[PDB]
A = this chain, B = another copy of it.
């Protein structure tokens, strides 16, 4: 049994990474194999700003 329950209060993009099981490489006579899976997050918050 797998469930994803996280209590987070953030003024940005939040992500919950839950895979449980992982991947495996076993390609007979394989030439090139690449597995890239990393959740990417990028944000910013602006509160009370007075340039002039």
Q: Return the contact of A36 from the options B9, B38, B43 (Cβ within 8 A).
A: B38
Contact check, B44 vs A41: say whether CB atoms are below 8 A apart. no
Contact check, B20 vs A21: say whether CB atoms are below 8 A apart. yes
Contact check, B30 vs A29: say whether CB atoms are below 8 A apart. yes
Residues of A in contact with B (beta carbons under 8 Å apart): 1-52
Q: Which residues of B contact A43 (CB under 8 A)?
A: 12-13, 41-45
Contact check, A47 vs B44: say whether CB atoms are below 8 A apart. no
Contact check, A17 vs B33: say whether CB atoms are below 8 A apart. no
Known: A31-B32, A47-B47, A49-B49. A12 touches B9 (CB 8 A): no
Q: Return the contact of A38 from the options B7, B18, B38, B49 (Cβ within 8 A).
A: B38
